[PDB]
Amino acid sequence: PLPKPVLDTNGKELNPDSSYRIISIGRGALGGDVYLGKSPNSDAPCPDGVFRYNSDVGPSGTPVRFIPLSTNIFEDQLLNIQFNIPTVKLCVSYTIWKVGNLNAYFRTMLLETGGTIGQADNSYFKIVKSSKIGYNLLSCPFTSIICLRCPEDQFCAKVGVVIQNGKRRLALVNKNPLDVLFQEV
Amino acid sequence: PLPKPVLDTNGKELNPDSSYRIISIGRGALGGDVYLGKSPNSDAPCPDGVFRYNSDVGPSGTPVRFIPLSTNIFEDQLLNIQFNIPTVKLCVSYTIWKVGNLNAYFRTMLLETGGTIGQADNSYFKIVKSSKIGYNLLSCPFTSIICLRCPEDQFCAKVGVVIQNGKRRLALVNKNPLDVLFQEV
């Protein structure tokens, strides 16, 4: 086997020194880029939610960068994701992606910022080829805990969307993973 | 294959209508029964921690009962665990076992009460034969989420102990599962 690089929308392999919008395969009303927004029921002083827009006809996404376990961004390998945008004084820490605590109402964990880099917590993801069209994000929370008889003793789950206050909120799901592409800025 | 019943300390199969102390295989200073205690850094109005004592020479455990997906308590099957003791007005809800949010300092989830019965949340456990001597408790949090390519798409982990304020606190661990027996009251 060989580590397979993840490609952007233009075919050029993904680069840690570059920034990408996470854009959806689906089009129009079925479309909308990932971005940083405010969770209605969050107490954080900063915007701390990972959302995708309701249509692709409007604002573009918030750019992100990917931080592999060194040194190349490959498929099926743990990495961190971080919004790459300038930030107020208070919010410099609310930029690294992470998966949150169990939410009883959605029965899943929601995607948020406030994570950390290079640590065996809830900030690790994977990029993998979708079953349908393109790429899926995977969340691998709890890398410090042995998942008994799991692929590499690791709990991983697909990233999809739930509706929270009539917005699309990225979260762990079972079916209908968000199919995405990475359009370099 | 056949469902194998879990046995108590006397050989009689485990009964949902009965109560058991969870006692350790280890003896003396290496011993101590599971019980309900107060978490130092918890804000709950009630005692909400699952601990084992520091020696078996002293107080006995807090009795628990087991609530299978009906109708018999078998090995390797989801169930709920609940302290069976009389309770103040406020604390009637803080009695069902559950696994808590990720604790950054211990890099694991701790065992607490305040869970619910029969719901696909963080209140499910399993009893299984230990690798060494006797029984292990397993925690299967997030039964609502597909663990990709995991045994029955389910994240499960072993239950052990961490030291919190010089007490033994039950929590998800990788090595050294708490080996236990069930001594009927």
CATH number, domain containing residue B35: 2.80.10.50
Residues 6+ apart with CB under 8 A from A100: A109, A110, A111, A112, A122
* Nearest C-alpha neighbor of B78 from the set B184, B180, B152: B152
**Judged by CB atoms within 8 Å, which residues 83-112 of B form the interface with A?**
101-102, 104, 107-109
Residues 6+ apart with CB under 8 A from B132: B25, B179
**Judged by CB atoms within 8 Å, which residues 133-172 of A form the interface with B?**
138, 141-142, 144-151, 155-158, 172
The position carrying tokens 């990720």 is: B102
* Nearest C-alpha neighbor of B97 from the set B51, B162, B54: B51
Task: Kindly list the residues from chain B whose CB atom is less than 8 angstroms away from the CB atom of residue A142.
Answer: 102, 109, 155
Task: Kindly list the residues from chain B whose CB atom is less than 8 angstroms away from the CB atom of residue A143.
Answer: none
Query: Cα distance from B143 to chain A (closest Cα, Å)?
Result: 9
Method: X-ray
Own/partner pairs, A148-152, CB within 8 angstroms, 24+ separation: A148/B138, A148/B151, A148/B156, A148/B157, A148/B158, A149/B150, A149/B151, A150/B147, A150/B149, A150/B150, A150/B151, A150/B155, A151/B148, A151/B149, A151/B150
- Distance from C-alpha of B180 to C-alpha of B6, rounded to nearest angstrom: 12
Question: Do B141 and A107 make contact, defined as CB atoms within 8 angstroms?
Answer: no
- Distance from C-alpha of B3 to C-alpha of B61, rounded to nearest angstrom: 28
Strand partners, B79: B68, B125
Please report the resolution in angstroms: 2.5
User: Among partner residues B107, B109, B150, which is closest to A147 by beta-carbon distance?
Assistant: B150
- Distance from C-alpha of A54 to C-alpha of A71, rounded to nearest angstrom: 34
- Distance from C-alpha of B49 to C-alpha of B167, rounded to nearest angstrom: 11
B182: part of which helix (H) or strand (E)? strand B180-184
Domain that holds residue A46: 1-185
Query: Cα distance from A168 to chain B (closest Cα, Å)?
Result: 19
Structural domain count, chain A:
1
Dmax over Cα atoms in chain B, in whole Å? 45
- Distance from C-alpha of B180 to C-alpha of B8, rounded to nearest angstrom: 10
A120 touches chain B (CB under 8 A): yes
Spatial contact of B136 and B158, defined as CB atoms under 8 Å apart: yes
What are phi and psi for residue B151, nearest 5 degrees? Answer: -55, 110
Question: Do B150 and A145 make contact, defined as CB atoms within 8 angstroms?
Answer: no
B116 touches chain A (CB under 8 A): no
* Nearest C-alpha neighbor of A48 from the set A34, A40, A36, A60: A36
Both structure tokens of A140: 């691998």
Query: Cα distance from B59 to chain A (closest Cα, Å)?
Result: 32
- Distance from C-alpha of A168 to C-alpha of A35, rounded to nearest angstrom: 10
* Nearest C-alpha neighbor of B127 from the set B181, B175, B64: B181
Residues 6+ apart with CB under 8 A from A86: none
Both structure tokens of A152: 């590499």
Spatial contact of A3 and A175, defined as CB atoms under 8 Å apart: no
User: What is the three-state SS of A106-143?
Assistant: CCEEEEEECCCCCCCCCCCEEEEECCCCCEEEEECCCC
Query: Cα distance from B103 to chain A (closest Cα, Å)?
Result: 9
The residue ranges of DSSP E strands in B62-113, in sequence order, are: 64-68, 79-83, 97-103, 108-113
What are phi and psi for residue A29, nearest 5 degrees? Answer: -70, -25
- Distance from C-alpha of A96 to C-alpha of A119, rounded to nearest angstrom: 12
Both structure tokens of A151: 């692929």
